[PDB]
Design a protein around this ligand. Structure first.
Ligand SMILES: N#Cc1ccc(Cn2cccn2)cc1
Length: 282
Protein backbone atom coordinates (compact mmCIF):
# COMPACT_ATOMS: atom_id res chain seq x y z
CA UNK A 1 0.00 0.00 0.00
CA UNK A 2 1.01 3.65 -0.26
CA UNK A 3 2.27 5.29 2.92
CA UNK A 4 -0.12 8.15 3.80
CA UNK A 5 -3.23 6.02 3.40
CA UNK A 6 -1.76 2.95 5.03
CA UNK A 7 -1.09 5.45 7.84
CA UNK A 8 -4.72 6.58 8.24
CA UNK A 9 -5.82 2.95 7.99
CA UNK A 10 -3.63 1.98 10.97
CA UNK A 11 -4.75 5.02 12.97
CA UNK A 12 -8.46 4.34 12.38
CA UNK A 13 -8.01 0.64 13.18
CA UNK A 14 -5.68 1.29 16.14
CA UNK A 15 -3.27 -1.49 15.16
CA UNK A 16 0.17 0.17 15.60
CA UNK A 17 1.17 -2.34 18.29
CA UNK A 18 0.34 -5.28 16.01
CA UNK A 19 2.22 -3.83 13.04
CA UNK A 20 5.25 -3.16 15.25
CA UNK A 21 5.19 -6.69 16.73
CA UNK A 22 5.18 -8.18 13.21
CA UNK A 23 8.40 -6.27 12.49
CA UNK A 24 9.95 -7.61 15.70
CA UNK A 25 8.96 -11.17 14.77
CA UNK A 26 10.42 -10.96 11.23
CA UNK A 27 13.67 -9.19 12.15
CA UNK A 28 17.05 -10.79 11.50
CA UNK A 29 18.97 -12.64 14.22
CA UNK A 30 22.73 -12.88 13.83
CA UNK A 31 25.46 -13.69 16.34
CA UNK A 32 27.06 -11.03 18.59
CA UNK A 33 29.78 -13.15 20.19
CA UNK A 34 32.49 -10.49 20.47
CA UNK A 35 30.11 -8.14 22.36
CA UNK A 36 29.43 -10.83 24.98
CA UNK A 37 33.05 -11.71 25.83
CA UNK A 38 33.74 -11.02 29.54
CA UNK A 39 36.54 -8.55 28.80
CA UNK A 40 33.98 -6.28 27.06
CA UNK A 41 31.38 -6.03 29.84
CA UNK A 42 32.30 -2.44 30.74
CA UNK A 43 32.19 -1.46 27.03
CA UNK A 44 28.42 -2.02 26.80
CA UNK A 45 25.83 0.27 28.30
CA UNK A 46 22.95 -2.24 28.09
CA UNK A 47 23.23 -6.04 28.21
CA UNK A 48 20.44 -6.56 25.67
CA UNK A 49 21.82 -4.15 22.99
CA UNK A 50 24.82 -5.49 21.07
CA UNK A 51 26.33 -5.10 17.57
CA UNK A 52 26.23 -8.13 15.26
CA UNK A 53 29.64 -9.63 14.52
CA UNK A 54 29.23 -9.31 10.74
CA UNK A 55 28.62 -5.53 10.76
CA UNK A 56 30.44 -4.24 13.88
CA UNK A 57 32.99 -1.43 13.63
CA UNK A 58 36.48 -2.57 14.58
CA UNK A 59 38.96 -0.25 16.27
CA UNK A 60 42.46 -0.31 14.72
CA UNK A 61 44.06 -1.69 17.86
CA UNK A 62 45.53 -5.14 18.44
CA UNK A 63 44.80 -5.39 22.18
CA UNK A 64 41.00 -4.99 22.04
CA UNK A 65 39.22 -3.88 18.87
CA UNK A 66 35.70 -3.79 20.33
CA UNK A 67 33.21 -0.90 20.40
CA UNK A 68 29.41 -1.04 20.56
CA UNK A 69 28.88 0.38 17.06
CA UNK A 70 27.48 -0.97 13.75
CA UNK A 71 27.86 -0.06 10.03
CA UNK A 72 24.43 0.23 8.37
CA UNK A 73 25.08 0.12 4.55
CA UNK A 74 22.05 0.99 2.36
CA UNK A 75 22.88 -0.21 -1.17
CA UNK A 76 20.01 1.21 -3.28
CA UNK A 77 19.98 4.56 -1.46
CA UNK A 78 23.80 4.80 -1.57
CA UNK A 79 24.04 5.96 2.07
CA UNK A 80 26.01 4.53 5.00
CA UNK A 81 25.61 5.30 8.73
CA UNK A 82 27.45 4.24 11.87
CA UNK A 83 24.98 3.74 14.76
CA UNK A 84 26.46 3.58 18.27
CA UNK A 85 25.56 3.89 21.95
CA UNK A 86 26.16 7.03 23.95
CA UNK A 87 29.79 6.87 25.12
CA UNK A 88 30.57 5.55 28.62
CA UNK A 89 33.22 6.97 30.99
CA UNK A 90 35.57 4.18 29.89
CA UNK A 91 34.79 4.42 26.13
CA UNK A 92 35.06 8.17 25.31
CA UNK A 93 38.57 7.63 23.92
CA UNK A 94 37.40 4.66 21.80
CA UNK A 95 34.55 6.79 20.42
CA UNK A 96 36.87 9.51 19.09
CA UNK A 97 39.31 6.89 17.83
CA UNK A 98 36.44 5.48 15.72
CA UNK A 99 35.51 8.95 14.40
CA UNK A 100 39.15 9.43 13.35
CA UNK A 101 39.72 5.97 11.82
CA UNK A 102 36.44 5.98 9.89
CA UNK A 103 37.02 9.54 8.47
CA UNK A 104 33.65 10.78 9.64
CA UNK A 105 32.84 14.48 9.22
CA UNK A 106 29.81 14.71 11.49
CA UNK A 107 28.47 13.37 14.79
CA UNK A 108 24.69 13.36 15.36
CA UNK A 109 23.52 13.31 19.04
CA UNK A 110 19.81 12.81 19.74
CA UNK A 111 19.72 12.77 23.59
CA UNK A 112 20.65 15.05 26.51
CA UNK A 113 23.46 14.06 28.87
CA UNK A 114 20.89 13.81 31.69
CA UNK A 115 17.29 12.69 31.13
CA UNK A 116 14.67 11.50 33.65
CA UNK A 117 17.17 12.39 36.42
CA UNK A 118 19.82 9.85 35.29
CA UNK A 119 22.94 10.00 33.11
CA UNK A 120 22.34 8.80 29.55
CA UNK A 121 25.89 9.34 28.23
CA UNK A 122 29.23 10.81 29.25
CA UNK A 123 30.14 14.50 28.73
CA UNK A 124 32.41 13.55 25.82
CA UNK A 125 33.11 16.98 24.23
CA UNK A 126 34.51 20.22 25.72
CA UNK A 127 32.18 22.97 26.82
CA UNK A 128 34.64 25.93 26.79
CA UNK A 129 37.16 26.98 24.12
CA UNK A 130 40.03 27.36 26.54
CA UNK A 131 39.45 23.93 28.27
CA UNK A 132 40.35 21.27 25.72
CA UNK A 133 40.15 17.48 26.31
CA UNK A 134 42.95 14.94 25.99
CA UNK A 135 42.20 11.20 25.67
CA UNK A 136 45.43 9.56 26.76
CA UNK A 137 44.45 5.94 26.04
CA UNK A 138 43.99 6.73 22.30
CA UNK A 139 46.31 9.78 21.95
CA UNK A 140 43.77 12.33 20.70
CA UNK A 141 43.08 15.99 21.55
CA UNK A 142 39.67 17.65 21.12
CA UNK A 143 39.00 21.44 21.17
CA UNK A 144 35.77 23.42 20.99
CA UNK A 145 36.09 25.98 18.13
CA UNK A 146 32.60 27.54 18.01
CA UNK A 147 29.02 26.84 19.12
CA UNK A 148 25.67 28.00 17.69
CA UNK A 149 22.67 27.45 20.01
CA UNK A 150 19.20 27.44 18.46
CA UNK A 151 15.76 26.72 19.86
CA UNK A 152 15.63 23.00 18.98
CA UNK A 153 19.27 22.09 18.38
CA UNK A 154 22.87 23.21 18.75
CA UNK A 155 25.71 22.94 16.18
CA UNK A 156 29.31 22.90 17.30
CA UNK A 157 32.59 23.05 15.41
CA UNK A 158 35.28 20.85 16.96
CA UNK A 159 38.96 20.23 16.11
CA UNK A 160 40.23 16.66 16.54
CA UNK A 161 44.00 16.18 16.53
CA UNK A 162 45.85 12.89 16.21
CA UNK A 163 48.70 13.57 18.65
CA UNK A 164 50.82 10.77 17.12
CA UNK A 165 50.95 12.39 13.63
CA UNK A 166 49.93 15.99 14.46
CA UNK A 167 47.24 15.78 11.75
CA UNK A 168 44.07 17.78 12.52
CA UNK A 169 40.48 17.61 11.27
CA UNK A 170 37.29 19.61 11.64
CA UNK A 171 34.30 17.64 13.05
CA UNK A 172 30.73 19.00 13.13
CA UNK A 173 28.57 18.11 16.19
CA UNK A 174 24.83 18.23 15.50
CA UNK A 175 22.95 18.03 18.82
CA UNK A 176 19.15 17.68 18.82
CA UNK A 177 18.26 18.96 22.30
CA UNK A 178 14.45 18.86 22.52
CA UNK A 179 13.31 15.24 22.17
CA UNK A 180 10.92 14.76 25.16
CA UNK A 181 11.86 12.64 28.19
CA UNK A 182 8.77 10.46 27.51
CA UNK A 183 7.13 9.60 24.17
CA UNK A 184 7.91 11.25 20.78
CA UNK A 185 7.51 14.81 19.48
CA UNK A 186 3.98 15.90 18.60
CA UNK A 187 5.05 17.34 15.20
CA UNK A 188 7.99 16.11 13.06
CA UNK A 189 8.72 19.63 11.83
CA UNK A 190 11.75 20.39 14.02
CA UNK A 191 13.23 16.89 13.57
CA UNK A 192 12.99 17.27 9.75
CA UNK A 193 14.52 20.76 9.91
CA UNK A 194 17.39 19.21 11.89
CA UNK A 195 17.86 16.39 9.33
CA UNK A 196 18.04 18.95 6.51
CA UNK A 197 20.70 20.90 8.43
CA UNK A 198 22.82 17.76 8.78
CA UNK A 199 22.40 17.06 5.06
CA UNK A 200 23.32 20.61 4.02
CA UNK A 201 26.63 20.36 5.92
CA UNK A 202 28.05 17.58 3.73
CA UNK A 203 28.24 15.12 6.66
CA UNK A 204 26.02 12.51 4.97
CA UNK A 205 27.77 12.71 1.57
CA UNK A 206 30.05 10.11 -0.15
CA UNK A 207 33.17 12.31 -0.05
CA UNK A 208 33.37 11.60 3.71
CA UNK A 209 33.29 8.53 5.90
CA UNK A 210 29.92 7.56 7.40
CA UNK A 211 28.19 9.90 9.82
CA UNK A 212 28.25 8.69 13.48
CA UNK A 213 24.75 8.81 15.06
CA UNK A 214 23.81 8.00 18.68
CA UNK A 215 21.28 8.35 21.44
CA UNK A 216 21.50 6.43 24.70
CA UNK A 217 21.33 2.85 23.31
CA UNK A 218 21.88 3.71 19.63
CA UNK A 219 18.71 1.99 18.33
CA UNK A 220 15.61 4.08 19.06
CA UNK A 221 15.85 7.79 18.17
CA UNK A 222 18.96 6.86 16.16
CA UNK A 223 16.93 4.39 14.11
CA UNK A 224 14.29 7.02 13.44
CA UNK A 225 16.93 9.40 12.06
CA UNK A 226 18.44 7.01 9.49
CA UNK A 227 15.10 5.39 8.55
CA UNK A 228 13.61 8.80 7.70
CA UNK A 229 16.70 9.95 5.75
CA UNK A 230 16.90 6.75 3.65
CA UNK A 231 13.17 6.65 2.84
CA UNK A 232 13.16 10.29 1.63
CA UNK A 233 16.26 9.68 -0.54
CA UNK A 234 14.63 6.64 -2.15
CA UNK A 235 11.48 8.67 -2.90
CA UNK A 236 13.69 11.15 -4.84
CA UNK A 237 15.60 8.46 -6.75
CA UNK A 238 12.76 6.19 -7.96
CA UNK A 239 10.31 6.67 -10.84
CA UNK A 240 7.41 5.77 -8.52
CA UNK A 241 7.86 7.32 -5.04
CA UNK A 242 4.73 5.55 -3.72
CA UNK A 243 6.63 2.25 -4.09
CA UNK A 244 8.78 3.08 -1.04
CA UNK A 245 7.79 0.65 1.73
CA UNK A 246 8.95 1.94 5.12
CA UNK A 247 8.48 -1.42 6.86
CA UNK A 248 10.70 -3.15 4.27
CA UNK A 249 13.37 -0.47 4.58
CA UNK A 250 13.32 -0.90 8.36
CA UNK A 251 13.71 -4.68 8.09
CA UNK A 252 16.66 -4.19 5.72
CA UNK A 253 18.35 -1.84 8.27
CA UNK A 254 17.72 -4.39 11.04
CA UNK A 255 19.95 -6.83 9.17
CA UNK A 256 22.83 -4.59 10.34
CA UNK A 257 21.87 -3.62 13.93
CA UNK A 258 19.28 -5.15 16.25
CA UNK A 259 16.29 -3.34 17.72
CA UNK A 260 16.07 -0.26 15.50
CA UNK A 261 12.87 1.61 16.41
CA UNK A 262 12.07 0.70 20.01
CA UNK A 263 8.30 1.35 20.34
CA UNK A 264 5.14 1.55 18.23
CA UNK A 265 5.07 5.30 18.92
CA UNK A 266 8.52 5.66 17.32
CA UNK A 267 7.25 3.67 14.31
CA UNK A 268 4.25 5.96 13.90
CA UNK A 269 6.47 9.01 14.28
CA UNK A 270 8.77 7.69 11.52
CA UNK A 271 5.81 7.40 9.14
CA UNK A 272 4.71 10.93 10.05
CA UNK A 273 8.19 12.33 9.41
CA UNK A 274 8.53 10.69 5.98
CA UNK A 275 5.02 11.74 4.95
CA UNK A 276 5.51 15.40 5.84
CA UNK A 277 9.04 15.48 4.54
CA UNK A 278 7.99 14.23 1.13
CA UNK A 279 5.78 17.31 0.65
CA UNK A 280 8.48 19.79 1.52
CA UNK A 281 11.00 18.20 -0.82
CA UNK A 282 8.90 19.25 -3.82
N1 LIG B 1 41.99 21.83 8.06
C1 LIG B 1 41.36 20.84 7.96
C2 LIG B 1 40.59 19.64 7.83
C3 LIG B 1 41.16 18.37 7.52
C4 LIG B 1 40.40 17.19 7.40
C5 LIG B 1 39.02 17.20 7.58
C6 LIG B 1 38.17 15.91 7.45
N2 LIG B 1 38.88 14.77 6.79
C7 LIG B 1 38.85 13.40 7.17
C8 LIG B 1 39.66 12.72 6.25
C9 LIG B 1 40.15 13.73 5.35
N3 LIG B 1 39.66 14.96 5.69
C10 LIG B 1 38.43 18.41 7.89
C11 LIG B 1 39.20 19.59 8.01
Amino acid sequence: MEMEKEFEQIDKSGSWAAIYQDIRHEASDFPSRVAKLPKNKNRNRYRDVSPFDHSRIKLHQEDNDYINASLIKMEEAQRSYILTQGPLPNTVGHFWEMVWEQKSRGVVMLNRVMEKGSLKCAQYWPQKEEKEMIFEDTNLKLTLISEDIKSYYTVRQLELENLTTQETREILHFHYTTWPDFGVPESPASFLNFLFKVRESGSLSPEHGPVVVHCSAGIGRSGTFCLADTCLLLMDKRKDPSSVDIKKVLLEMRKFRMGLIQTADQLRFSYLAVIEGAKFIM
